[PDB]
Amino acid sequence: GNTVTIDFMSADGIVPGRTPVRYQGVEVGTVQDISLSDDLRKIEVKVSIKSDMKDALREETQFWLVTPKASLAGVSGLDALVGGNYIGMMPGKGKEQDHFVALDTQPKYRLDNGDLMIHLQAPDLGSLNSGSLVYFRKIPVGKVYDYAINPNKQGVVIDVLIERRFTDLVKKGSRFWNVSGVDANVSISGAKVKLESLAALVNGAIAFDSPEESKPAEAEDTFGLYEDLAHSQRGVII
Amino acid sequence: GNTVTIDFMSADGIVPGRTPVRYQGVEVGTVQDISLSDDLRKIEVKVSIKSDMKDALREETQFWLVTPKASLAGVSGLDALVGGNYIGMMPGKGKEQDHFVALDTQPKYRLDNGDLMIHLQAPDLGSLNSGSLVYFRKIPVGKVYDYAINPNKQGVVIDVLIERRFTDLVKKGSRFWNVSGVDANVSISGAKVKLESLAALVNGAIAFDSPEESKPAEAEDTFGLYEDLAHSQRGVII
Incomplete structure (x- = not known):
């Protein structure tokens, strides 16, 4: 008292x-x-x-x-x-x-509980809220901790918090993409609208990839946040 | 007592x-x-x-x-x-x-906490309520404070309240637009209905832009409120 x-x-x-x-x-x-x-x-x-x-x-x-x-x-x-x-x-x-x-x-997150704290750079925040969830193989392995505009007014820096036992998943060659909201396509000769993720609709979500052979990323390493899975396909620019 | x-x-x-x-x-x-x-x-x-x-x-x-x-x-x-x-x-x-x-x-908002209090002029209120939210790069940086009909009966003046640390974002050459409700398009060769913003559906929202080189706006500066992102595109009238 x-x-x-x-x-x-x-x-x-x-x-x-x-x-x-x-x-x-x-x-x-x-x-x-x-x-x-x-x-x-x-x-x-x-x-x-x-x-x-x-x-x-x-x-x-x-x-x-x-x-x-x-x-x-x-x-x-x-x-x-x-x-x-x-x-x-x-x-x-x-x-x-x-x-x-x-x-x-x-x-800013200063304590070290073993968790990993990396930054993502997006042109806008999207549907992501503080407390939105991070998936790997649609398994929640972390959450979005904070979001803040960088000193240049173009981008938004979104820094996430991967859990401790899942730090091995994040590599240098990982690509992060956005899975938030619903996209419903009406296609020719059948229009397959399939609802996959229910938790991403209300609050928003980020999925990510893990490549085969790369060093595990650490210590506030930046990443580009692609807007969709098709934009995060690997390949060669021609 | x-x-x-x-x-x-x-x-x-x-x-x-x-x-x-x-x-x-x-x-x-x-x-x-x-x-x-x-x-x-x-x-x-x-x-x-x-x-x-x-x-x-x-x-x-x-x-x-x-x-x-x-x-x-x-x-x-x-x-x-x-x-x-x-x-x-x-x-x-x-x-x-x-x-x-x-x-x-x-x-009327009289006190000075450092927040910015600017006026918007729209032909009608739209879906905006008192307490609807103001976005920059889809980050909430303020809210709609009040709305009132101006002395001419044509327009509605909607005055908003940008937060203190985000006053740098508002410039003289900013354009404000309305992001409220859902617009669903059925298009040829595929009909992509994507749900971006969930919070704007129930209550309404106003997003805005920050240009590169302009003086920061202040002291109840007026702004036109465009009805859509396509109506707030910059360009030259021909």
């Missing part, structure tokens, strides 16, 4: 009843009070944090509000059936600190 | 149990009583507001009822799963005041 003041932009989904401070999915703190400061729409939020984290609480502790994913219940308007909000934290070396400014978005 | 009387038109969704006064998303007050005044269907609502806001409570304090967004659950009829109502406030210089007349709609 302590008093930690964090300044937010907008007070949406933050209740003094149940709004936890989930450090790595662990309920550490609990929001106690929400007060307002009139300058620049400043929102002073008082939070009671446990004792061992309070000794770990230092100046380079990044707070950010966490909002639920873009879901079918979020677009339908069922605000009582989606869930609730929380805030996340990442402490650093810093100094002793009580007054904190919250961050606008999620920080 | 105080007594503040506000006059409303219709008493829908206002319960003495839980109806807060959300100033900038902060639960400041709580509705205590709903009584009726017979002239012109006047509804006197007694509200208990906290002490510091009561010292901030002055004559130029605009009150308005807040109703949930036009959603799929709002059109389906699930009145128990959408949510609840509240009222919002904006205090001004004014004078000491107890008796307030509520406002019919949301006031």
